[PDB]
Paper text:
Here, by electrophysiological and structural analyses, we show that the neck and aperture in hBest1 are both indispensable Ca2+-dependent gates, and their dysregulated opening by rationally designed or patient-derived mutations causes Ca2+-independent leak and elevates Ca2+-dependent channel activity.
The Y236A, Y236C, and W287F mutants all conducted Ca2+-dependent Cl− currents significantly bigger than those from WT hBest1 under the same conditions, indicating gain-of-function phenotypes. Moreover, the Y236C and W287F mutants retained the CH3SO3− to Cl− relative permeability but not the trans-promotive effect of CH3SO3−, functionally resembling hBest1 3A, rather than hBest1 I205A. Moreover, consistent with our conclusion that hBest1 W287F is a gain-of-function mutation with increased open probability of the neck, a cBest1 W287F mutant structure shows a constantly opened neck. To understand the structural bases of these mutants, we solved the structures of KpBest Y211A, W252A, and W252F at 2.6, 2.5, and 3.1 Å (equivalent to hBest1 Y236A, W287A, and W287F), respectively.
Residue numbers in the entry:
A (entry chain B): 23 to 285
B (entry chain D), E (entry chain E): 23 to 289
C (entry chain C), D (entry chain A): 22 to 288
Amino acid sequence: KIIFRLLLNVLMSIIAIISYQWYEQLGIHLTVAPFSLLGIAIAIFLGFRNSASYSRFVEARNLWGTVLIAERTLVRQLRNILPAEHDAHRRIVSYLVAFSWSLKHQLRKTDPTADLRRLLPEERVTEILASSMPTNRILLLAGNEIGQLREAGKLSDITYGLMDNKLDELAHVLGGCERLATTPVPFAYTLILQRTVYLFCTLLPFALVGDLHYMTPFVSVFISYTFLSFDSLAEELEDPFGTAANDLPLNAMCNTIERNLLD
Amino acid sequence: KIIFRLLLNVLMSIIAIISYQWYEQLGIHLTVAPFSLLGIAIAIFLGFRNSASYSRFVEARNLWGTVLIAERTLVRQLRNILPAEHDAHRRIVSYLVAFSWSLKHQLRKTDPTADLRRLLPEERVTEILASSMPTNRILLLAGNEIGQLREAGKLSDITYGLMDNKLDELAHVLGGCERLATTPVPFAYTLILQRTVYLFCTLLPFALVGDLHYMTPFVSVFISYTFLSFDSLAEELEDPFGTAANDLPLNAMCNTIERNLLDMTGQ
Amino acid sequence: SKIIFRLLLNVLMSIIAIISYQWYEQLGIHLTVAPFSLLGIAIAIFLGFRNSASYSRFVEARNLWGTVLIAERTLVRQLRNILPAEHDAHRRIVSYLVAFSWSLKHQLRKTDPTADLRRLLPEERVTEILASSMPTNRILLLAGNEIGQLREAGKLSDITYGLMDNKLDELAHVLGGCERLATTPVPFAYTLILQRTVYLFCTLLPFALVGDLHYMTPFVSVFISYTFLSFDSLAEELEDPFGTAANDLPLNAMCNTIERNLLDMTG
Amino acid sequence: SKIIFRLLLNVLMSIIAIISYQWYEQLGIHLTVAPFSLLGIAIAIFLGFRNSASYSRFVEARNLWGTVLIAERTLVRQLRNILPAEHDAHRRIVSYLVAFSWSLKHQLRKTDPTADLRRLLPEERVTEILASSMPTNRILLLAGNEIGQLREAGKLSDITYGLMDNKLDELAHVLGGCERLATTPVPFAYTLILQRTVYLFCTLLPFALVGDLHYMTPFVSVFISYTFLSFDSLAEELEDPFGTAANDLPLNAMCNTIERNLLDMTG
Amino acid sequence: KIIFRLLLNVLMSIIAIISYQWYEQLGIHLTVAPFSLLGIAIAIFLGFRNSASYSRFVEARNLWGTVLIAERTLVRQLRNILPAEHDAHRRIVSYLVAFSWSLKHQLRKTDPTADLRRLLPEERVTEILASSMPTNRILLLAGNEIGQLREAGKLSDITYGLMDNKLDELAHVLGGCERLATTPVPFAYTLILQRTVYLFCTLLPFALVGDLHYMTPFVSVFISYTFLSFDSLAEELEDPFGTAANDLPLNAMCNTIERNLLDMTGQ
Ligand SMILES: [Zn+2]
Ligand SMILES: [Zn+2]
Ligand SMILES: [Zn+2]
Ligand SMILES: [Zn+2]
Ligand SMILES: [Zn+2]
Ligand SMILES: [Zn+2]
Ligand SMILES: [Zn+2]
Ligand SMILES: [Zn+2]
Ligand SMILES: [Zn+2]
Ligand SMILES: [Zn+2]
Ligand SMILES: [Zn+2]
Ligand SMILES: [Zn+2]
Ligand SMILES: [Zn+2]
C-alpha cells in the first residue's frame, strides 16, 4: 500500500504549493527544525519497535525449527535402540506427524480433524479432538507408546529417558508457540506508530515547501518512502503464523517433517 | 491520563501565543535548536529505557510459559511411567495446580488460601500458609510425592530423576518471578525520564512559538503525542504481574493449567 | 545526590556566561549551538550504548545471586526426598550452604568472613577453609565431601548422588560468575571518561547557548544538564552491584532470605 | 569493491551540480541541507538496525558450524575413552562423521555430495544416503546405527550409549539451525530496498550540499557517501554465510579442519 | 597515541584560523551542517560497531570463566567420588592445568613446550606436541585417565558420565576460543571506520572555524576527543586474546586456575 500513500504525498505537496503563497496572508508558518526533531524521534522509535517485532518472528522460527530437530532425533533413536519394532515405528511417527499438523492448525485457528483422520485411527481422532489442547494430547499418546515399550522391557529406564526428553523438547515448543500466539506483547502500539508515521508523512510537504518550493514533492516523497519502507517491515514481521505469504511457511514445514519421518 | 496532558498541552500553546508579545520586551529569546538537542537526547534515552522494560516483560511471560510446560510434562511422565497409580496422579496434579495458583497470588500481593484449599487437604494447607515461603513449600510436598513413589520401589532412580528435573525447572521459574518482583532495585529512572518527558512536552511550545506562531499548538501537540505515546509504552511493560489490561493474563493462564492437567489425568 | 551539586554548578556557570557575553567579540570567542548539538547527540548515543552494557551486567549479578537461592533451595528439597531419614546429615549440609552464601558476600565486599563460619561450622573446618586460597571453593569441596560420604555409605545411588552434585555445579558456576564480575575491574575504559565528557559538555553548554538565548541560558542549560546527568548517574548505580550504596545490591538481606528459606525447609 | 563505482558517480554528480547552481533559481527552487540531514540520520539509524539483523544471522551461522567441530571432537573422544580398542568402530564412525560435515557443506551450497561421499564411504551406503530426503539426516541415522550396533553387542551400556547419543543430538540441532537459516530466512525484502534508498541518497545528495559548499562539494559529498556506502556494504558481506565469496565462510576449509582433527584423533 | 591525534588536531585548528582567508578563492566553504550529519551518522555507526565488538569480548571472557568453573568441579567430583585415588588426582590435575596453558599458548600462537614439560610426562608431551591440535590432544589424554578409572571399576558409568560431561564444558570452550580467534569477521570494517573517524576529526575544525574562530581549537578537541574515545574503545575489545594491555590477562588467568587446582589436591 506504499505506492498509494506515496502518490498521496504527491497530492499533499501539490496542495502545499498551490496553498503556500497564502501563509502570512492568513497566518501560519512552518520550519524544518521541528519536523526533523520529530523525524529523528520517529526514526529512533521505529527502530526499537521493529527490533521487537523482528524478535517475535525470529523466536517463532526457532520454535518451529525445534519441532523438526526433536521429531527427527526421536525417530532416529527408535530406529537405533529398537531397530526391529517397526509396528511401533509407524505408531510413533504418525503421532509425531499428527502433532506437527495439529500445531499448525492450532496456530491458524483451523480444523485439524481432516488431517488427523489421514494419519491416525478415528478412535484416536475423537480422543484427540476432545481435549482442551489436542497437541498436548498427541504428545501424551507419543509418551504412551514410548512407555509401553518400557513396561514391555524393550527399553531400559535409561533409554526411556533419552526418548522421553524429546517429548520434553516438543512440550517446551508447544508452550512457546502458545506464548507468542496467545500473548501478543503490546502490539497495539504498532497501530499507534503507524498512524504517527502517516501523519508525519502528510505534513512534511507543508513544512518543507518553504525551503524547497517546486522541489517540495521530489524530496517529500523520498523521505516518506524511507520512513514508509521502515514501518512496513513491522507489518510484515509481527504475525509469524498468519495467512500472509511472508509469515512462516507452516504447511511447507509440516510436509518437510512428514517426508523426513517416513522411513 | 495521556489525553489529560495532550489537552494541557494546548493550554500551554495558547498560553504561549498570548504570552508572545512580552517576549522581546521581557528579555526572553527561545530557539528550537537546543530543544532538538534535548528531544533527540530524551528520545534516545527512552529507546534504551523502553528496551529494558520490554526485556523484563518478556522474561515474565517466558517464565510463566515455563510453568505450563513443566507441569504438562511432569503429569505426562506420571501417566507414561506410572499409568496405574492415579492415587498419586491426583495428589501430584493437585500440588502442581496449587503451585501455579500460589505463585499468581504471591505476585498479585493477595491471599492465596481459597484456591489453595479448593485443591488440597487442610492438613498441608496449614504447613504451607504456616511457611514464609509457601510456593516453595508446595514444591517440597510435590517432591515428597515423587520420593514416596520411589521408596515404594514404583520409580527407579532414573525415572525419579526424570520428574525431579521438571521440579527443578519449576524452582527456577519461582526464583525468576521472585527476582523480577524481588524489588525494582533503584530503577527510579523510569520515573525520572517520565517526569522529564512531561516537562519537555510542556516547554516545547514556548520554544516553537517564534518559528510557528499560530501554527504552534498542532505541531507541539503532535510531538507531545509522539513522545508521550512511546514513553507510556514503558509504563505497561514495566509492571507485568499486575491487575492491568495489557498486563499478563495470569488468571487465564492458571485456569488453562488446571484444565490442562485435569484433562490429561482423565477427570 | 552528588548531582544536585552539579546542577547548582551549572547554574553558576551559565551566570558566568551571561555576565561574560560582553568580552566575546573582543576576546574573539564565538560559541554557537550547532557544533554542540553534534557533541550532545554523539554523547547521548554513547550513553545509551554504555548504560546498555551497565544494565546488562547489573542484571547478570542480580541473576547470579537469585541462582544461589534456587540451587540451594533445591539441594535441600532433594535431601528431604531421597533421604527423608538422615536429618542429622542435612544440617551439616545446610550449614555449608549458608557458609557458602556469606563467604560469597564477604568474598565480594572484600571483608574477613571468619566471624561468620564460626556461627555455622566447627573450627577444625574453619582453619582448613581459610587455609585455602579461595574459601567459597573450599566450602563447596566440603559440601561435596558430605554428599559423597552419603554416596560411599550406600545411602545414595550414583543416580541420586548425581542429582545432587549437579546443584553444586548450579553453584560453582555462580561462584565463577561473581568472580568474573568482581575481577572485571569495571570496564570504566569509557565510563569514567563518559562521566567526565558529560560534565565538561554540561558546563560548556551555557557558553554555546548564551549567544542565542541571553537571560534564558541557565534554565535551558540546567534542563539539558539534568537530562544528561540523570541518565549518566544510572551507571554510577548499576556498576557496583557488590557494594553498599542504596542502589548496590542488598547482599545481607539476600543471604538472610537464603538462610530463612533453608531453615524453614529443614523443619 | 564496485563501491568506488558509486563514489565515482558522486564526483561526477558534484561536477554537474557545481556547474548547475546558476540554473538552479530557474524557478527560485533550491535544495537545502536540513531535510537531507533528516533523511540522512534516519537512514543511518535504519542501517544500524538492519545491519544488526544481518550480523546476527552471520554470527549464528558461524556458531553452528563451530559446534560441528566441537561435537564430533567429543564423540570421537568418548569412542577412544570408552571403547579404546574397537578400531573397526573407530574408523566407521569417523567416516560417517566427516561425511556428515562435507555433506552439510554441499547441502547449503546446493552442490553435489556424490563425490566426497564416494571418497569416504562404500557405495553400498553412498546410495542409501543419496536417495534420502535429507542425506545429512540419513548420515546421522547411520552413525546412530553404529552406536546401537555397539550397544546391542553389549560393548556399551545404556549409560555410555546415552552419553554418545547426546552428541548425535548436538549434531542434529546444528543441521536444524543451518536448514532454518537457508530454507526459512526472515523477510530478506527490506535489505535490498535499503541499498536502493542509500544509493539514491548518495547521488541526490550533492545537489543539496552545493548551495552550501561551492567548489568543495566533490571532496565532501564523497566522504559522506563513503561512510554510508561502507556501513551498508556490511549487509552484503554478512547475509550469505554459506555462499561463495572471499567475504563468506570458508566451509571447505572448515571441513578440512574437521577431517584433519578426527584423523588426528585416530592416529 | 590518541593524544597524538589530539595535538595534531589542535595544529589543524590553528591552520584553519589562518588559511580561512583564501577560502574566498573560487568557493571552498565548509559548513557545520554537513559535518553534523556526518558526525551523527558516524556516532550511530560507531555505536552498532562497538556493540558487536563488546559482545565478542564478553564472549571471550565467559569462555575462560568456564575453563575455571569446569576444571574446578571436575577436580571436586574426583575427590568426593574417588577420595582415596590421589595418584589419579595428581595426573588428571596435571592434564587440566596443561589444557589451560596449551589453550593460551594456542590463542597467542606462542610455543607451549615450556609449560607442557613442566606439567606432563615426557612421553605425553611428545604426543601432544606431535598433534596438529595439541589442546584437543590434551582433552583426549585427560579422557584416557578417567576412562581407565572406569575400565578399572573405580568409576561406574553414572559417575563417569558425571565427569565426561566436564570434558565437554571444556571442549565447548576450546571450540569457542578457536572461532573467536579465526576472525576478523568482515575482514576488518572496524579499521575502515577508524580511518573514517580520524578524517572526520582532522577535518572538523576547517568546518567549525567560520563560526567558532579561536574557540575552534577547543570545541574541536572536545569533539575529536569524544569520537576518538568511543572509537578507541573498539581496538581494545576486538583482540581479547592479545598481547596488548587492554586484553584478557590469560597468564594471570592460567595462574589463578593452576593454584586453584593445586589448593584442591593438598599440594
Ligand atoms: Zn522405520
Ligand atoms: Zn494420570
Ligand atoms: Zn485407591
Ligand atoms: Zn488466607
Ligand atoms: Zn524441561
Ligand atoms: Zn535449579
Ligand atoms: Zn559446571
Ligand atoms: Zn531436612
Ligand atoms: Zn582407532
Ligand atoms: Zn535435543
Ligand atoms: Zn557559497
Ligand atoms: Zn588428590
Ligand atoms: Zn558436548
